[PDB]
Amino acid sequence: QASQSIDQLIKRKGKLYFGTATDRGLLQREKNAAIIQADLGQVTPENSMKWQSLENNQGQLNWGDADYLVNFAQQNGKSIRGHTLIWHSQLPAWVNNINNADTLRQVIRTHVSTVVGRYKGKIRAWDVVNEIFNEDGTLRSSVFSRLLGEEFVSIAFRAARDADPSARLYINDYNLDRANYGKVNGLKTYVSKWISQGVPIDGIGSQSHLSGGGGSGTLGALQQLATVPVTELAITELDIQGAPTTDYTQVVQACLSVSKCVGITVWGISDKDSWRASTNPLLFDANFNPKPAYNSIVGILQ
Ligand SMILES: [Cl-]
Ligand SMILES: [Cl-]
Ligand SMILES: [Cl-]
Ligand SMILES: [Cl-]
Question: Roughly what angle, to the nearest 10 degrees, separates helices 101-118 and 151-163?
């Protein structure tokens, strides 16, 4: 508990949530659960719903940790962002080893249908595809693009939609942090085309893994993304090297500046548990005390 809940404060501004990545280990130790209960309104499984976590060995599903997180969120009234169905990283070898396009086509459908279907009605939004773009806005090379070209996106989103018609379906990526950056332009172009073709893409997630000074670009980037006929945007994996108060407040102000942005998720609670731990990039220190960046956000939401 940081005293003054940023989720409560941001809801009063008209946003949906301020949330965090988490999972069972975190929830069961130290102050992670208590902070989520007091200060946050949303959770994303940091790893438990990635395909390698769920199905490292083909046909052998591993739902436990994912189920646990969903239960925690439901019992504590936090919304959930499912993360993530189709991603080149943290991918089972057996999927990577597929050589035939139609094989993959049907594997994607089965995986997407099964995972979304399991939590139908419980998960508000899904990162259906993750990190599919190169830095210049072309499609990233992976088993998905290699075998199916852009078609894997249509396949994944349509399967997700039918598995839960009420879920908000997102495409998620990093380096969507500066207006007119190649990746932003490419994403805008492709997502617009896919939407026009009937692909059900409801949201764009901007991961926002930033370095110092990176907050100055967030506003322009979100404003550009907002021009895409998605319904929602979100900052999905926020962290910033050194957690500068200026950059953190600028990102929050950017969200507040764009109607389509529904909320912010930071990528973890305590610096100690960050995937970029050496850069102290989160809102709570190793002792689970709020850092100046947290307090500064409280100040401007006040
Ligand atoms: Cl209130
Ligand atoms: Cl403990
Ligand atoms: Cl296997
Ligand atoms: Cl709703």
Answer: 30
Question: How far away, in angstroms, is 52 Cα from ligand 3 center?
Answer: 11
How many Å lie between the centroid of ligand 2 and the Cα of residue 288?
12
Note the ligand closest to the C-alpha atom of 4: 1
Which ligand gives the minimal distance to the CA of 91? Answer: 3
Taking the CA of 9 as reference, the closest ligand is 1
User: What SS3 state is found at 235?
Assistant: strand
| CA 12 to ligand 1 centroid distance, Å | 7
Please name the residues in contact with 67: beta carbons below 8 A apart, sequence gap of 6 or more: none
Q: Which domain holds residue 264?
A: 2-302
Residues 6+ apart with CB under 8 A from 49: 66, 69, 82, 83, 84, 115
> In the chain, how many domains are there?
1
What phi and psi, each to the nearest 5 degrees, are found at residue 240? -145, 120
For residue 150, the surrounding DSSP H or E stretch is: none
Resolution in Å, one decimal, please. Answer: 2.0
Give the method used.
X-ray
CATH number at residue 236: 3.20.20.80
- Chain-centroid distance, C-alpha 26: 18
